[PDB]
Amino acid sequence: NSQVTVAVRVRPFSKREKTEKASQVVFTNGEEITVEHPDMKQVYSFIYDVSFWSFDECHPGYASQTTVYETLAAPLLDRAFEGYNTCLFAYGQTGSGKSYTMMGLNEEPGIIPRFCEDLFAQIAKKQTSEVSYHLEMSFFEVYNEKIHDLLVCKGENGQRKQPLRAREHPVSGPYVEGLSMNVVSSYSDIQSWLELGNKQRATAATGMNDKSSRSHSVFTLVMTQTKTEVVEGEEHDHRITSRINLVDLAGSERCSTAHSSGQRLKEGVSINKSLLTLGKVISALSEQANGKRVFIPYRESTLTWLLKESLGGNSKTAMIATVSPAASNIEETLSTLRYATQARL
Amino acid sequence: MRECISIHVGQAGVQIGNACWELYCLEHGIQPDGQMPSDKTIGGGDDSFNTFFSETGAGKHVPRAVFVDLEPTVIDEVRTGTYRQLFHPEQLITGKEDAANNYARGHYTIGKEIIDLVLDRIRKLADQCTGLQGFLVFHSFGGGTGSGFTSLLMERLSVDYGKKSKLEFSIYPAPQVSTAVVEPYNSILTTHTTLEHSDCAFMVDNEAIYDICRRNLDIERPTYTNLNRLISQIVSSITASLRFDGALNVDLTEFQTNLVPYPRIHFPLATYAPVISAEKAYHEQLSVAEITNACFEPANQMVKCDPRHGKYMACCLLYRGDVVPKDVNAAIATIKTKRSIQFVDWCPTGFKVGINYQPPTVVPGGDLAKVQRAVCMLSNTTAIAEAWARLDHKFDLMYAKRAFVHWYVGEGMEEGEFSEAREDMAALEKDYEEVGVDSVE
Amino acid sequence: MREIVHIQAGQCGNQIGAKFWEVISDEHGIDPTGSYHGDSDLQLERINVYYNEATGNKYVPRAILVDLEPGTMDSVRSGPFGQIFRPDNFVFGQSGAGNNWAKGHYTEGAELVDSVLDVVRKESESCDCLQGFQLTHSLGGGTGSGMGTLLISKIREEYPDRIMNTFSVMPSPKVSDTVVEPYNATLSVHQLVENTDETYCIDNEALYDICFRTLKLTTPTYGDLNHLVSATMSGVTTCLRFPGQLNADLRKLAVNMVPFPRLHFFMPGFAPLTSRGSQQYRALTVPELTQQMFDSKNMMAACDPRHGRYLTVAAIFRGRMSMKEVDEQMLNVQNKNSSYFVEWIPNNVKTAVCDIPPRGLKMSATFIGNSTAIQELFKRISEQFTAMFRRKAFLHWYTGEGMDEMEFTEAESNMNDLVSEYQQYQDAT
Numbered sequence A: 001n002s003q004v005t006v007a008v009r010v011r012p013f014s015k016r017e018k019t020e021k022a023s024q025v026v027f028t029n030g031e032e033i034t035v036e037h038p039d040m041k042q043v044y045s046f047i048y049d050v051s052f053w054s055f056d057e058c059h060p061g062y063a064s065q066t067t068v069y070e071t072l073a074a075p076l077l078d079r080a081f082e083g084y085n086t087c088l089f090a091y092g093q094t095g096s097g098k099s100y101t102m103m104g105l106n107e108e109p110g111i112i113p114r115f116c117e118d119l120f121a122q123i124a125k126k127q128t129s130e131v132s133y134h135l136e137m138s139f140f141e142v143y144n145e146k147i148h149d150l151l152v153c154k155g156e157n158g159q160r161k162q163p164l165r166a167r168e169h170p171v172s173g174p175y176v177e178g179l180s181m182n183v184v185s186s187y188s189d190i191q192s193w194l195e196l197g198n199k200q201r202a203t204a205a206t207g208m209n210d211k212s213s214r215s216h217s218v219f220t221l222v223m224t225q226t227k228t229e230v231v232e233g234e235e236h237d238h239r240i241t242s243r244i245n246l247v248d249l250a251g252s253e254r255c256s257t258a259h260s261s262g263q264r265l266k267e268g269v270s271i272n273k274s275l276l277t278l279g280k281v282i283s284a285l286s287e288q289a290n291g292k293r294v295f296i297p298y299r300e301s302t303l304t305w306l307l308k309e310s311l312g313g314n315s316k317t318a319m320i321a322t323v324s325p326a327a328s329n330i331e332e333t334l335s336t337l338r339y340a341t342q343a344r345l
Numbered sequence B: 001m002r003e004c005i006s007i008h009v010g011q012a013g014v015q016i017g018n019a020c021w022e023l024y025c026l027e028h029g030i031q032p033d034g035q036m037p038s039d040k041t042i043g044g045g046d047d048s049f050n051t052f053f054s055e056t057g058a059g060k061h062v063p064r065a066v067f068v069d070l071e072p073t074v075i076d077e078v079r080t081g082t083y084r085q086l087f088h089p090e091q092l093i094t095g096k097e098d099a100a101n102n103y104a105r106g107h108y109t110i111g112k113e114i115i116d117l118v119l120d121r122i123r124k125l126a127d128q129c130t131g132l133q134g135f136l137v138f139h140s141f142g143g144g145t146g147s148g149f150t151s152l153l154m155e156r157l158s159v160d161y162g163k164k165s166k167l168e169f170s171i172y173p174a175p176q177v178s179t180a181v182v183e184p185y186n187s188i189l190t191t192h193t194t195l196e197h198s199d200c201a202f203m204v205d206n207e208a209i210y211d212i213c214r215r216n217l218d219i220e221r222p223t224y225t226n227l228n229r230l231i232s233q234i235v236s237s238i239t240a241s242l243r244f245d246g247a248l249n250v251d252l253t254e255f256q257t258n259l260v261p262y263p264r265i266h267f268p269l270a271t272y273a274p275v276i277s278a279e280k281a282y283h284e285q286l287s288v289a290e291i292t293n294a295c296f297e298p299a300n301q302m303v304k305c306d307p308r309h310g311k312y313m314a315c316c317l318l319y320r321g322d323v324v325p326k327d328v329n330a331a332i333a334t335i336k337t338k339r340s341i342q343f344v345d346w347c348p349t350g351f352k353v354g355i356n357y358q359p360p361t362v363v364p365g366g367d368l369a370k371v372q373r374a375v376c377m378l379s380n381t382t383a384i385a386e387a388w389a390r391l392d393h394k395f396d397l398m399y400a401k402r403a404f405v406h407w408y409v410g411e412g413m414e415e416g417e418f419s420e421a422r423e424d425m426a427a428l429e430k431d432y433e434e435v436g437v438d439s440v441e
Numbered sequence C: 001m002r003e004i005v006h007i008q009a010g011q012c013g014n015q016i017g018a019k020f021w022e023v024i025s026d027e028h029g030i031d032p033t034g035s036y037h038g039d040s041d042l043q044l045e046r047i048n049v050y051y052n053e054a055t056g057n058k059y060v061p062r063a064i065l066v067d068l069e070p071g072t073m074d075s076v077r078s079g080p081f082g083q084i085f086r087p088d089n090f091v092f093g094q095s096g097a098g099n100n101w102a103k104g105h106y107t108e109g110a111e112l113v114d115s116v117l118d119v120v121r122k123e124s125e126s127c128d129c130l131q132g133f134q135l136t137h138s139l140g141g142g143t144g145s146g147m148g149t150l151l152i153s154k155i156r157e158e159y160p161d162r163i164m165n166t167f168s169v170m171p172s173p174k175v176s177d178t179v180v181e182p183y184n185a186t187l188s189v190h191q192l193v194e195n196t197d198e199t200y201c202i203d204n205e206a207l208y209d210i211c212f213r214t215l216k217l218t219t220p221t222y223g224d225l226n227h228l229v230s231a232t233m234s235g236v237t238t239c240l241r242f243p244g245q246l247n248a249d250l251r252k253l254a255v256n257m258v259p260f261p262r263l264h265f266f267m268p269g270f271a272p273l274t275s276r277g278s279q280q281y282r283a284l285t286v287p288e289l290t291q292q293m294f295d296s297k298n299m300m301a302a303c304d305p306r307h308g309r310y311l312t313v314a315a316i317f318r319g320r321m322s323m324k325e326v327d328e329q330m331l332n333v334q335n336k337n338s339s340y341f342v343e344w345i346p347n348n349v350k351t352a353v354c355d356i357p358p359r360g361l362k363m364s365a366t367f368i369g370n371s372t373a374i375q376e377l378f379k380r381i382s383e384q385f386t387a388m389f390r391r392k393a394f395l396h397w398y399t400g401e402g403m404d405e406m407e408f409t410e411a412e413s414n415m416n417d418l419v420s421e422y423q424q425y426q427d428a429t
């Protein structure tokens, strides 16, 4: 079992909050990301493996959208060609800079298309006769611990959504029963299928923001390395397979501060449990490498259950936290960083 | 007039009130139904004392208190017991379901839609009072109600009533003894709020009073209605200067000043030295010096913390009965001459003193004895950090594995909130180290 | 007003319930007709926890009997306390399950369950507040193994924010009363770890031992084993009905006794059980009940806690007592017997008290416990399973009613995975 990698990325500022002209709390002495209140009763200091400083375009070591790819995401691609599975997560609440980093906008790209483009580049470089690759994409979510596919039946069909169910092949692993995945050939089809999905992610308008996601979106790609017929006969190790998972999680959203009942409270309760189990899984998996007999609780959550074959074994994991530099979110921001520490140790 | 509103949250607060009022009604001359026979016979005096009991024109007397537990199994013993014709029927049961020993239930999901009645009855009782100066609260740090409803209530009352003393006579969990395996959690999350909102939070521990009940009262098999009858005596020694006369009187806006150096260290202790039995009541003098010295003994403390591992920042001494001042000003000098008892360099004055003329009352069916004098100490010590750390360690032992946490997030809670509360509990065990340091120049 | 909806499922559940209502009625003062013939007022203040009311000061119970293929409607109705149940609640069908988990989950259950739930609604909405459900079934058969668990799923979907207690009889390490016990048990545990908050793993051999060693009964029938299970069934829900000093509920005993969700398989016990001769030569105090409870002979689970570590135990006391004795005696166990407990929970025991004891005693008790020794109960079936599933043993009677082989494998892994969560916490860290 390999090590989990954890990083942090601070957004510059939002023009919406800038009407208030609130203050700055986060500071960076290289890799010790210090936090300070306006009162300065205490001063917190968090140390992580990696740290991205995107507060303003003055400081050296500014981490442009390019800098995340070569630093965190490109090794996932380099290992996927070796047959090993990979996973990337993303943890931050509404307004953190999360979907800016996953995909960005058409002019400032994120992590998904810049990854899937270099993927096809290294394919077309090695699309020889001895080797021939095949890609397949799927995109689903988790709402109240129910799996839904974002690319099926488009709603308005009597019923609302299709609650698929998870099962366990004995040797292949966990899987979803009823997920017509897709086939791809190049990059634009991925963008079309993904724009078709995110419109149907079951978001909801909480008081803090009009668009706040209440689902853990999962994007899975499957890569195969088929080889050719050897001279003696028709048998050749052509089943080298790999699986790339990219998750866009939701925010913790504590409910005492945000007076929410009825259905948002159930959503929140489903979101805080998945996050807790995910943290427990990552901590156990990072404690197994250091030498210990520990049980990894996959089965206590669906997102940790379907991805059992992507975290354990000899696979690689990665996590990106996103925090606001303001003081208004100081109780929110700190929580994220605290979770990241639990992933590091 | 002077008044004090007494709130009683949870089973602990209810079982304490059922003794506190049993004592007050007897101190003032009130039957369990409400009617006093003394006012018609003697024809004078304010024995219907307005600090706790309001009066109706029909000769009836109505207490200034409220009850709420989110479980009707307790208060229904009042609505069907001996004290039913006294209390207002608005004893806010809302117990369609209990709070499962988790703060997340007493805070949001069974603590909302119930609190409005509480904050309405408190307004109704405050409108009846002219010179209100106190919101006493009785709860327990351990349970979901005492931890959650109390924090949902104090944060509301600090908005509503604001510049008004609040006092929490709470039950701190014991190190070894316990009746639950979540008290290390429900206690830390409470401090994170009451530390900011409350003004002076006393603390008692059932282990200490158990020990007191065997080494002094000769009871080998005690129950809770023996300890609650000592807690009632504490609250009566506190609230006596409000009701009865005395040479040196002490109001509730004086503990808040002479025992609270900084706003975050308002967690004192409490004692009551003569708890002697009717057999040992004879064979003994029970003078001011003996009692005052007994208040400074570790064995007689109603909280489990060796005060010799720390220093005293302040201390009050509320006497009750036949006492003379120079007996007191001779008793304290013997304490300052002693080298086991320490005092911070920033408080040589140290002592607040209070005297009252009304002696205690002996509740029948009881273990306490008749005494011509009785005392209650209220000390602020730097030793109770060692009692706080014992909880914090437990937290760190059952949060590294994230145990029992899903029962909290399952009822409206975030993981990081637990971490934030632990950070708040660590800042306070550091300030106690700051105050304990001798200055240098 | 907290309220419990009982459900019977199968022969075991029907007989055990028939003996449980015979033990709650006596506790409350109700006769076979439904009339009140009590002596105290404190039996009616909270009679709503199990019984509904009716016209002539009568009281009807909230039972929902379910057993495809009858043979027991006659046995309960004809019995002494049978004509108190609601006849519309006598649900049943023909074509018995035949000791198959499939016929009681897929074929015959699917065409009966929609008539069962239609009573739960009719018996749930009438409750002012609902604390949870109480099922009584036995693994090994078809009704208790399949139909009860299907009901559990259908009810945890509708009423999720509640408690589904399930007091389950389990197979044994020796002679059994059914040949296909392992497969039904495996396929039930897969559906009882994900959809349940508190289950009691009762075994019959531990009850034969309790009846032959302590009680010194020579010819014990099934109507004497249930007379022990009913004790626990009443003792758990006493802090809702009767008052006390430290009250409780089904949710306090589920928040403290379940550190992680899957580990909700408990290990019950009742004290003071004794022979008629040794009743004159004993004393009734707290420590006697404590020793009789923590002893490995009074547990009903066919597992030895001395082979494992207690994660969390409970003790619902009943009687006029002193908490100075209770807390002291429950701390003495943690201090003396430390290796039988875990260190990453500081205190491993809570206490509950009620001031109102049993009809003929002065102080009773009821012990719940969450040990790792339940490992040994599920390390057995998973062997039997993989002693049979390999050769494709009595399985054509399962595939022949709409079940693939994969469903047999999944339930084998989850159980095994559960065994690897109890055994994680059985050695020093």
Ligand SMILES: CC(=O)O[C@H]1C(=O)[C@@]2(C)[C@H]([C@H](OC(=O)c3ccccc3)[C@]3(O)C[C@H](OC(=O)[C@H](O)[C@@H](NC(=O)c4ccccc4)c4ccccc4)C(C)=C1C3(C)C)[C@]1(OC(C)=O)CO[C@@H]1C[C@@H]2O
Residues within 6 Å of the ligand: C022, C023, C026, C027, C215, C224, C225, C227, C228, C230, C231, C234, C235, C272, C273, C274, C275, C276, C279, C358, C359, C360, C361, C364
């Ligand atoms: C002088 C005396 O002690 O009489 C006892 C008695 O001797 C003993 C042996 C009773 C006796 O019970 C048994 O012998 C027995 C037989 C088979 C299986 C289990 C028990 C007793 O019959 C049983 C009976 O128990 C009760 O009445 C409780 O209410 C019990 N309910 C019923 O027994 C009951 C059953 C069906 C119909 C009506 C009532 C109960 C238990 C737990 C929770 C609530 C109620 C009692 C006190 C006794 C006798 C009568 C001898 C004991 O019963 C229980 C469950 O406590 C057996 O061990 C206890 C210890 C008692 O000492």
Ligand SMILES: Nc1nc2c(ncn2[C@@H]2O[C@H](COP(=O)(O)OP(=O)(O)OP(=O)(O)O)[C@@H](O)[C@H]2O)c(=O)[nH]1
Residues within 6 Å of the ligand: B009, B010, B011, B012, B015, B016, B069, B071, B098, B099, B100, B101, B102, B139, B140, B142, B143, B144, B145, B146, B147, B171, B178, B179, B180, B206, B224, B227, B228, C245, C246, C247
């Ligand atoms: N001194 C004293 N303490 C009590 C008494 N009753 C309960 N306690 C304490 O209260 C704690 C339990 O929490 P409580 O707040 O009383 O529980 P509750 O009030 O019923 O509310 P829930 O937790 O929701 O059940 C235990 O740790 C006891 O030590 C009492 O009568 N006297």
Ligand SMILES: Nc1ncnc2c1ncn2[C@@H]1O[C@H](COP(=O)(O)OP(=O)(O)NP(=O)(O)O)[C@@H](O)[C@H]1O
Residues within 6 Å of the ligand: A009, A010, A011, A012, A013, A014, A054, A092, A093, A094, A095, A096, A097, A098, A099, A100, A101, A211, A212, A213
């Ligand atoms: N690294 C960055 N550098 C520069 N600008 C940034 C950066 N990250 C975020 N921003 C800006 O801040 C905005 C972040 O807000 P927004 O994109 O709405 O949050 P979001 O993460 O996309 N919503 P959600 O998916 O719920 O987290 C972006 O749209 C940019 O305008």
Ligand SMILES: Nc1nc2c(ncn2[C@@H]2O[C@H](COP(=O)(O)OP(=O)(O)O)[C@@H](O)[C@H]2O)c(=O)[nH]1
Residues within 6 Å of the ligand: C009, C010, C011, C012, C013, C015, C016, C097, C099, C138, C139, C140, C141, C142, C143, C144, C145, C169, C177, C178, C204, C222, C223, C225, C226
């Ligand atoms: N304790 C007890 N167990 C019983 C009784 N009747 C049957 N059993 C047990 O139930 C198991 C068989 O399950 P069964 O009742 O036939 O379930 P069903 O086939 O669905 O009705 C066996 O292990 C028996 O030991 C009873 O009256 N009391």
Ligand SMILES: [Mg+2]
Residues within 6 Å of the ligand: B010, B011, B069, B070, B071, B098, B099, B143, B145
């Ligand atoms: Mg309670």
